[PDB]
Amino acid sequence: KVFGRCELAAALKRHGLDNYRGYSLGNWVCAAKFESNFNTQATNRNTDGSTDYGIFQINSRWWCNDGRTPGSRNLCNIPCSALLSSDITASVNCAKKIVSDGNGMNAWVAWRNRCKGTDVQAWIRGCRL
């Protein structure tokens, strides 16, 4: 499913992401925009052979099992395909674990390079929340 900007913002808010670990809603919406363009079905293969899945492009090396990433860890205890569902609950629950990992949102390279330090509030501007 390809989410609309305000639609996603509202879904994330409902799932408790607004200010989770100190990160305002605009940060999560900005990260989703640049990581997957709001597409739940987005996947991208990495050079090390692992693959990124879903709206938040969660990596198979540590977070989910895809059955093809040798020696990976599956910290979120889910098959990576669950991360591509139109229901974002799995992606959200796993993102919460990742952001709590100590590195915060820097875990997402697109957030670090394109969202960090920018007017992220602009991403929820105009939305009925």
Whether the Cβ atoms of residue 48 and residue 61 lie closer than 8 Å to each other: yes
Residue 119's domain comprises 1-129
**Given resolution (angstroms):** 1.8
Tell me how the structure was determined.
X-ray
Q: Is 23 helix (H, G, I), strand (E, B) or coil?
A: strand
CATH of the domain at 69: 1.10.530.10
Q: Is 129 helix (H, G, I), strand (E, B) or coil?
A: coil
CA 33 to CA 31: how far, in whole Å? 5
Please tell me whether 101 is known to bind a ligand. Answer: yes
Whether the Cβ atoms of residue 1 and residue 86 lie closer than 8 Å to each other: yes
Other C-beta atoms closer than 10 Å to the C-beta of 122 total 11
Question: What residues are labeled active site?
Answer: 35, 52
Domain count, the chain: 1
